[PDB]
Amino acid sequence: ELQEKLIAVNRVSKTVKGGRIFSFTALTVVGDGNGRVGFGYGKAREVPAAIQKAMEKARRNMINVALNNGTLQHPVKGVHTGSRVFMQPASEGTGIIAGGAMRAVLEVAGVHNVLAKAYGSTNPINVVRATIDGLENMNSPEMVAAKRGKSVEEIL
Amino acid sequence: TVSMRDMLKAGVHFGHQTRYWNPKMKPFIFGARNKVHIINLEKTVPMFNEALAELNKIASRKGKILFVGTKRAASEAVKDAALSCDQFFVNHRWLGGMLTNWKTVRQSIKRLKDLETQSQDGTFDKLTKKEALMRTRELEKLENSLGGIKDMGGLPDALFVIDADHEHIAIKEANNLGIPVFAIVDTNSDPDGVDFVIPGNDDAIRAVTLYLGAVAATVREGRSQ
Amino acid sequence: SMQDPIADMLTRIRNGQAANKAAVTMPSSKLKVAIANVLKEEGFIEDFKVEGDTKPELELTLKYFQGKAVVESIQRVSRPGLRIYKRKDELPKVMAGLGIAVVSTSKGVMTDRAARQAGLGGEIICYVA
Amino acid sequence: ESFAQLFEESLKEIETRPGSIVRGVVVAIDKDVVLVDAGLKSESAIPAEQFKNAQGELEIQVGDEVDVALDAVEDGFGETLLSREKAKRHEAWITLEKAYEDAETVTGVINGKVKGGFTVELNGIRAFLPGSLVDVRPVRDTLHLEGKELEFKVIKLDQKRNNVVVSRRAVIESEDPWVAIAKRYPEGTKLTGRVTNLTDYGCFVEIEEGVEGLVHVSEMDWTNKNIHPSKVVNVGDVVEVMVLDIDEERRRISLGLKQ
Amino acid sequence: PEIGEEVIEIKAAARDPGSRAKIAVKTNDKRIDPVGACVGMRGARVQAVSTELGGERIDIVLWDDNPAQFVINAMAPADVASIVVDEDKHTMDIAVEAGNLAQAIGRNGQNVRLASQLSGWELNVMTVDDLQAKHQAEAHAAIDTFTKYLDIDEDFATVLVEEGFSTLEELAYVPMKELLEIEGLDEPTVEALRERAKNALATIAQAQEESL
RNA sequence: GUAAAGCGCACGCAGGCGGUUUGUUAAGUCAGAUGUGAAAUCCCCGGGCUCAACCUGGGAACUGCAUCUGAUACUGGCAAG
RNA sequence: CGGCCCCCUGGACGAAGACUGACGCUCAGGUGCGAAAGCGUGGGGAGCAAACAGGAUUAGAUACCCUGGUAGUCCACGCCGUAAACGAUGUCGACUUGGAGGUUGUGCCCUUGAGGCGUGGCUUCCGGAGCUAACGCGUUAAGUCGACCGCCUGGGGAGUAC
């Protein structure tokens, strides 16, 4: 039921007395096609093991997101370290207008319709984190009604 | 259940000095006496009662309780308390990642159990002396570390702690896993990670004992229920 | 020097929400009062109380729902350096309608929805979410 | 309610700062630490050497009560300054009692003049005296049976510096530190001084009215450099020391202990 | 292996080997997901038990909290909506709809026994309409019993039993202040009418004395 | 602050911004109307060339400017505090 | 900016009151002050010391080290107008958890003692939330905001040429 996308894999080095020890980092993200989403960032000497780790980590520490039907509930900004991200709810049919790692996380999240730009850095890791942050902070109408002591129709 | 007079007698109301406090504890502080913080018993009591009730409820559903104190003043007492209600405890140094990294520690438990078996049930004696001394030493080490939690099986369903600042590693583990935390929190301590905080003197022995005894009684009650 | 009182208000509120302050006090002004009233109506705060004769002090009481604050965001829009005036058609929607935009109009200060209903625009004071 | 506020001020009313109210019940003994609870934030890590009387064995079991001392709080965890100092206040009260009737009567046995004046000891403690006071007249207890028993009749006390000289015999007979710092001066006046803190080059014995002495590291013993003062004497103990040197200007009285 | 390392709280296993094997399991809230681990990648481990000892309809239910959530979980895999309770023998009265009852009940002698041991006691699968039918068959009876309790005039009794919840059968132990809100409450008399019902219970005990 | 980027420091004209209360004005601001904003182009609904491009009817738009009539919370002016 | 004294003189802070009644903040151009070195004229010249000379060192030593040593450093009056002129952090105002100090006021308190409880100004260190690329900053912000100004737009060429 869960869908999982390996966003990126990158070779990283550690210099030692002999020479360079190489290793691989795997950035993955998983989601159930609904609110729930989680990213994982694994590392191992070989690629498949590292992606396996990324999947494992993503599977835990997931996070829920309040989706109005296929899209978002309102425009939302999210940042992390360099990657600053804007994403905006959009009409059915438009699809996921987003670039790169961001796209991937959106798809697994089960959002189908967004207009979305990544300002600043586009370092996959940071940008996916920023996306997750923007999705988490985003609140729903019912939530704001509760926050504020009102009905949904009062807020419209 | 536990009265205010008794707590006063114990020395709960006493709290750390005025240069060592935490401003998140400002609500729980009443005043400062001889440049020493006083804990507000009026606000402490009801919450302590609450915490007791929650612990009882946990017990009723057959919850596993872990008693943590590594202050080495009240290690004996926390062990005693754990045993009275036949629950589990960590009276010596908490192993970093005992709960988060359970699966590894579970092997540790198993090795300890095997060693215990060898010692007692085998009755095999006839072991090379140095080797026998080494095995004995290993047994002692593992008993000290994991004696209380050996029969635990899996992960506790609640975590009682005697000092938050001292056992912050355990607290953090519980939070990461989501285990309910029941902490005694002096003025210097940080109660943010704690779910059911308890403002009381972690240091004084009699106060610690009192805390323990009430907790044990309510666990026993929940078991009876 | 102090140049924008309203903005100072909003910053005070923001800082109180951040710091989990129960109530936030500051010198009173009519526009400030009206803004506070609007917020209360829109439920971002519990209650506001002006007190004093010579130099009265507005005291708002801040709102906290499940630990975290109610006023998720609060920005000035109009400011002394650069004023913003909006016509009724052009009026904004804060957080896609979930938040509000305080707007001063000829018929008083009101939320953006209220202004739209009335059929008139004006100076956009602040967004609240 | 105000129950608690009234209690807080009640409990203020029923404790004081110094070691005055004998309140701490000995709730755990083990060698070499005694511990009490005088209604303080924590329990005191008491030495055994505050509580053995005059021949080297303990005297108080569980439940027993002595007050300790205060006005210093939490070096990082714990509570007190020790209780024998409390006993010093009782000794001071006994000495003051003399004033009432102009005669304090105890046993006082003064064999030899440490710093000019015979040393007189009251039950547990031993204090040092100025010369004249040991004897009412030139009688000179050197010809008396050693460590003889008479009493103490006060000849001289310094009234800020605990130097008290008393008259053993003859029952029938009946700023501030630094201007005139020439009393213990001449070359070699020995003193009885409690050490305060050993700074790994020193010991800081300093007793005589707000002064500072250093018996630092060189004498201390009859080994020079491998000594490490903490091993060789004590913490908080009244000892043999004498001046050897005074600055009245740069306030460095450089005592010694090899004597 | 999670279950083996105390990560999947498995209490009872009310299952019928050789047919259906539905069992619920709890877990310490720590992003574990008990059923998920028991299932695996597209029922990876689920298929193992499926063709383990023989073609069995193994099922896993995400245990929520206490026995109330165990009831619905014992009705799975299906669609429970509500259920009744009692004392020692609560008898979980399954409340579903005819359309969903076909799958819920599954087989007359299969899911009625497999889900009966699920809670350890026994369940009584019923229908949404059935519940209401029996529900009313209870309102009339604290009244449907020849009215052997308080009793006074009948014209006042009808207007009192109109607003009266659960008739008057032992209702004095409930709130004795909301019937005073009723249009007509001078001196404590209705608070006394309930006392009459208590006396009626004593009278019923006297009737037991007449029969014992 | 360290990546480019705080005048070496001040005073200070012009300029920019301006505590709080009342009154007034109505310049800014907002609302409505009138006049205009060529046609074509763009966009919406239609029609005609077999379709399309293309042609084409009606609308919308042309975010503006000018006026007149209102509104007066805010900003401004004036008067008193 | 550092020995004492005197004469003339600017600012800061506190204590209470009394008064004025928005008179305020910022500031392109403009004006002033602006280390050291340097320049001009006139004085002065102990020590130190660019330049210079000799002796060493060295492969060489137009340096480092040694012996000497003149401009200058000092004073008066002018000019110069720059420095890693740095907190590499523009000015003014408001708001946001704490601890340990220093310094300088001041209110009360039995100063019963060097103290006890406050309340102001300036100031050093640590550290929370928050912020930050991180380092770190952290009520003296690099946090949360407002007003005004200054400045940046790849490295070199170049802060150079005209």
PDB file of N, CA and C in Angstrom, chain C residues 74-123:
ATOM      1  N   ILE C  74       1.249  36.988  12.015  1.00  0.00           N
ATOM      2  CA  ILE C  74       0.623  38.298  12.015  1.00  0.00           C
ATOM      3  C   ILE C  74       1.576  39.344  11.459  1.00  0.00           C
ATOM      4  N   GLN C  75       1.226  39.908  10.312  1.00  0.00           N
ATOM      5  CA  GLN C  75       2.077  40.858   9.614  1.00  0.00           C
ATOM      6  C   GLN C  75       1.341  42.166   9.397  1.00  0.00           C
ATOM      7  N   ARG C  76       2.055  43.275   9.532  1.00  0.00           N
ATOM      8  CA  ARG C  76       1.562  44.504   8.943  1.00  0.00           C
ATOM      9  C   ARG C  76       1.633  44.421   7.434  1.00  0.00           C
ATOM     10  N   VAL C  77       0.790  45.209   6.788  1.00  0.00           N
ATOM     11  CA  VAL C  77       0.813  45.288   5.341  1.00  0.00           C
ATOM     12  C   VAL C  77       1.007  46.748   4.974  1.00  0.00           C
ATOM     13  N   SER C  78       0.059  47.594   5.362  1.00  0.00           N
ATOM     14  CA  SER C  78       0.319  49.022   5.329  1.00  0.00           C
ATOM     15  C   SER C  78       1.348  49.367   6.384  1.00  0.00           C
ATOM     16  N   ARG C  79       2.198  50.332   6.068  1.00  0.00           N
ATOM     17  CA  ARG C  79       3.191  50.808   7.012  1.00  0.00           C
ATOM     18  C   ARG C  79       3.542  52.234   6.652  1.00  0.00           C
ATOM     19  N   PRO C  80       4.079  52.994   7.597  1.00  0.00           N
ATOM     20  CA  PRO C  80       4.317  54.412   7.333  1.00  0.00           C
ATOM     21  C   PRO C  80       5.199  54.625   6.133  1.00  0.00           C
ATOM     22  N   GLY C  81       6.204  53.770   5.968  1.00  0.00           N
ATOM     23  CA  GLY C  81       7.087  53.909   4.830  1.00  0.00           C
ATOM     24  C   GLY C  81       6.350  53.759   3.516  1.00  0.00           C
ATOM     25  N   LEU C  82       5.345  52.882   3.482  1.00  0.00           N
ATOM     26  CA  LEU C  82       4.710  52.505   2.221  1.00  0.00           C
ATOM     27  C   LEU C  82       3.288  52.059   2.535  1.00  0.00           C
ATOM     28  N   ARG C  83       2.330  52.909   2.212  1.00  0.00           N
ATOM     29  CA  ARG C  83       0.942  52.605   2.494  1.00  0.00           C
ATOM     30  C   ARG C  83       0.363  51.704   1.421  1.00  0.00           C
ATOM     31  N   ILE C  84      -0.616  50.908   1.826  1.00  0.00           N
ATOM     32  CA  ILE C  84      -1.331  50.023   0.923  1.00  0.00           C
ATOM     33  C   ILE C  84      -2.809  50.358   1.034  1.00  0.00           C
ATOM     34  N   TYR C  85      -3.435  50.629  -0.103  1.00  0.00           N
ATOM     35  CA  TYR C  85      -4.869  50.845  -0.183  1.00  0.00           C
ATOM     36  C   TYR C  85      -5.438  49.934  -1.248  1.00  0.00           C
ATOM     37  N   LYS C  86      -6.555  49.306  -0.937  1.00  0.00           N
ATOM     38  CA  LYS C  86      -7.126  48.308  -1.813  1.00  0.00           C
ATOM     39  C   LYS C  86      -8.575  48.651  -2.108  1.00  0.00           C
ATOM     40  N   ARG C  87      -8.978  48.387  -3.338  1.00  0.00           N
ATOM     41  CA  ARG C  87     -10.364  48.507  -3.736  1.00  0.00           C
ATOM     42  C   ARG C  87     -11.061  47.173  -3.523  1.00  0.00           C
ATOM     43  N   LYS C  88     -12.380  47.234  -3.347  1.00  0.00           N
ATOM     44  CA  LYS C  88     -13.104  46.084  -2.824  1.00  0.00           C
ATOM     45  C   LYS C  88     -12.888  44.833  -3.661  1.00  0.00           C
ATOM     46  N   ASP C  89     -12.847  44.972  -4.983  1.00  0.00           N
ATOM     47  CA  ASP C  89     -12.601  43.811  -5.823  1.00  0.00           C
ATOM     48  C   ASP C  89     -11.219  43.245  -5.569  1.00  0.00           C
ATOM     49  N   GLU C  90     -10.258  44.123  -5.351  1.00  0.00           N
ATOM     50  CA  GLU C  90      -8.872  43.745  -5.235  1.00  0.00           C
ATOM     51  C   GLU C  90      -8.538  43.249  -3.830  1.00  0.00           C
ATOM     52  N   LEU C  91      -9.498  43.208  -2.913  1.00  0.00           N
ATOM     53  CA  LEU C  91      -9.156  42.847  -1.544  1.00  0.00           C
ATOM     54  C   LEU C  91      -8.607  41.424  -1.463  1.00  0.00           C
ATOM     55  N   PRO C  92      -7.724  41.149  -0.511  1.00  0.00           N
ATOM     56  CA  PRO C  92      -7.013  39.871  -0.482  1.00  0.00           C
ATOM     57  C   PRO C  92      -7.779  38.787   0.259  1.00  0.00           C
ATOM     58  N   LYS C  93      -7.170  37.604   0.257  1.00  0.00           N
ATOM     59  CA  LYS C  93      -7.634  36.453   1.020  1.00  0.00           C
ATOM     60  C   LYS C  93      -6.445  35.850   1.741  1.00  0.00           C
ATOM     61  N   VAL C  94      -6.437  35.964   3.057  1.00  0.00           N
ATOM     62  CA  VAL C  94      -5.316  35.479   3.843  1.00  0.00           C
ATOM     63  C   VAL C  94      -5.467  33.982   4.039  1.00  0.00           C
ATOM     64  N   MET C  95      -4.414  33.245   3.704  1.00  0.00           N
ATOM     65  CA  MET C  95      -4.408  31.803   3.863  1.00  0.00           C
ATOM     66  C   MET C  95      -5.596  31.183   3.142  1.00  0.00           C
ATOM     67  N   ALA C  96      -5.897  31.713   1.967  1.00  0.00           N
ATOM     68  CA  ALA C  96      -6.991  31.198   1.170  1.00  0.00           C
ATOM     69  C   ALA C  96      -8.282  31.223   1.977  1.00  0.00           C
ATOM     70  N   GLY C  97      -8.477  32.319   2.701  1.00  0.00           N
ATOM     71  CA  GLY C  97      -9.703  32.561   3.413  1.00  0.00           C
ATOM     72  C   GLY C  97      -9.721  32.068   4.839  1.00  0.00           C
ATOM     73  N   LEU C  98      -8.767  31.228   5.220  1.00  0.00           N
ATOM     74  CA  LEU C  98      -8.756  30.709   6.580  1.00  0.00           C
ATOM     75  C   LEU C  98      -8.295  31.768   7.566  1.00  0.00           C
ATOM     76  N   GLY C  99      -7.328  32.586   7.165  1.00  0.00           N
ATOM     77  CA  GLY C  99      -6.911  33.718   7.958  1.00  0.00           C
ATOM     78  C   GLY C  99      -7.725  34.941   7.608  1.00  0.00           C
ATOM     79  N   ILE C 100      -7.373  36.057   8.239  1.00  0.00           N
ATOM     80  CA  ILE C 100      -8.051  37.309   7.951  1.00  0.00           C
ATOM     81  C   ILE C 100      -7.063  38.412   7.658  1.00  0.00           C
ATOM     82  N   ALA C 101      -7.608  39.463   7.076  1.00  0.00           N
ATOM     83  CA  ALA C 101      -6.884  40.680   6.771  1.00  0.00           C
ATOM     84  C   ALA C 101      -7.685  41.820   7.368  1.00  0.00           C
ATOM     85  N   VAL C 102      -7.117  42.464   8.378  1.00  0.00           N
ATOM     86  CA  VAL C 102      -7.718  43.670   8.919  1.00  0.00           C
ATOM     87  C   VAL C 102      -7.602  44.770   7.881  1.00  0.00           C
ATOM     88  N   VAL C 103      -8.706  45.447   7.615  1.00  0.00           N
ATOM     89  CA  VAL C 103      -8.723  46.539   6.668  1.00  0.00           C
ATOM     90  C   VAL C 103      -9.530  47.672   7.266  1.00  0.00           C
ATOM     91  N   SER C 104      -8.965  48.864   7.223  1.00  0.00           N
ATOM     92  CA  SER C 104      -9.648  50.069   7.644  1.00  0.00           C
ATOM     93  C   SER C 104     -10.411  50.614   6.454  1.00  0.00           C
ATOM     94  N   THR C 105     -11.682  50.911   6.661  1.00  0.00           N
ATOM     95  CA  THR C 105     -12.560  51.421   5.645  1.00  0.00           C
ATOM     96  C   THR C 105     -13.288  52.637   6.183  1.00  0.00           C
ATOM     97  N   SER C 106     -14.006  53.295   5.282  1.00  0.00           N
ATOM     98  CA  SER C 106     -14.762  54.476   5.666  1.00  0.00           C
ATOM     99  C   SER C 106     -15.733  54.163   6.788  1.00  0.00           C
ATOM    100  N   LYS C 107     -16.251  52.945   6.816  1.00  0.00           N
ATOM    101  CA  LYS C 107     -17.242  52.552   7.816  1.00  0.00           C
ATOM    102  C   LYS C 107     -16.589  51.842   8.993  1.00  0.00           C
ATOM    103  N   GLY C 108     -15.318  52.137   9.250  1.00  0.00           N
ATOM    104  CA  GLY C 108     -14.617  51.546  10.372  1.00  0.00           C
ATOM    105  C   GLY C 108     -13.619  50.477   9.964  1.00  0.00           C
ATOM    106  N   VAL C 109     -12.995  49.882  10.967  1.00  0.00           N
ATOM    107  CA  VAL C 109     -12.018  48.827  10.721  1.00  0.00           C
ATOM    108  C   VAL C 109     -12.711  47.479  10.826  1.00  0.00           C
ATOM    109  N   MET C 110     -12.493  46.620   9.837  1.00  0.00           N
ATOM    110  CA  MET C 110     -13.183  45.342   9.796  1.00  0.00           C
ATOM    111  C   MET C 110     -12.314  44.329   9.073  1.00  0.00           C
ATOM    112  N   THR C 111     -12.713  43.070   9.163  1.00  0.00           N
ATOM    113  CA  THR C 111     -11.996  42.041   8.435  1.00  0.00           C
ATOM    114  C   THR C 111     -12.305  42.141   6.948  1.00  0.00           C
ATOM    115  N   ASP C 112     -11.423  41.546   6.146  1.00  0.00           N
ATOM    116  CA  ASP C 112     -11.540  41.683   4.700  1.00  0.00           C
ATOM    117  C   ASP C 112     -12.866  41.133   4.198  1.00  0.00           C
ATOM    118  N   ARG C 113     -13.293  39.993   4.730  1.00  0.00           N
ATOM    119  CA  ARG C 113     -14.574  39.426   4.335  1.00  0.00           C
ATOM    120  C   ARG C 113     -15.698  40.411   4.598  1.00  0.00           C
ATOM    121  N   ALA C 114     -15.686  41.016   5.779  1.00  0.00           N
ATOM    122  CA  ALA C 114     -16.733  41.953   6.152  1.00  0.00           C
ATOM    123  C   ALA C 114     -16.760  43.121   5.189  1.00  0.00           C
ATOM    124  N   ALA C 115     -15.581  43.640   4.866  1.00  0.00           N
ATOM    125  CA  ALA C 115     -15.487  44.735   3.916  1.00  0.00           C
ATOM    126  C   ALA C 115     -16.074  44.331   2.573  1.00  0.00           C
ATOM    127  N   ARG C 116     -15.695  43.147   2.094  1.00  0.00           N
ATOM    128  CA  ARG C 116     -16.198  42.652   0.821  1.00  0.00           C
ATOM    129  C   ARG C 116     -17.712  42.597   0.842  1.00  0.00           C
ATOM    130  N   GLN C 117     -18.257  42.074   1.930  1.00  0.00           N
ATOM    131  CA  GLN C 117     -19.697  42.015   2.089  1.00  0.00           C
ATOM    132  C   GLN C 117     -20.299  43.404   1.999  1.00  0.00           C
ATOM    133  N   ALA C 118     -19.688  44.358   2.691  1.00  0.00           N
ATOM    134  CA  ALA C 118     -20.173  45.730   2.669  1.00  0.00           C
ATOM    135  C   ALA C 118     -20.167  46.282   1.256  1.00  0.00           C
ATOM    136  N   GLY C 119     -19.106  46.002   0.512  1.00  0.00           N
ATOM    137  CA  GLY C 119     -18.940  46.570  -0.808  1.00  0.00           C
ATOM    138  C   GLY C 119     -18.037  47.781  -0.805  1.00  0.00           C
ATOM    139  N   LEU C 120     -16.889  47.672  -0.144  1.00  0.00           N
ATOM    140  CA  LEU C 120     -15.959  48.789  -0.099  1.00  0.00           C
ATOM    141  C   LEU C 120     -14.583  48.301   0.326  1.00  0.00           C
ATOM    142  N   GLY C 121     -13.545  48.967  -0.185  1.00  0.00           N
ATOM    143  CA  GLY C 121     -12.178  48.690   0.179  1.00  0.00           C
ATOM    144  C   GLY C 121     -11.585  49.775   1.061  1.00  0.00           C
ATOM    145  N   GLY C 122     -10.270  49.694   1.241  1.00  0.00           N
ATOM    146  CA  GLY C 122      -9.584  50.676   2.060  1.00  0.00           C
ATOM    147  C   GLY C 122      -8.157  50.259   2.350  1.00  0.00           C
ATOM    148  N   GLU C 123      -7.635  50.790   3.451  1.00  0.00           N
ATOM    149  CA  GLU C 123      -6.236  50.596   3.808  1.00  0.00           C
ATOM    150  C   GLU C 123      -6.055  49.259   4.505  1.00  0.00           C
TER     151      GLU C 123
END
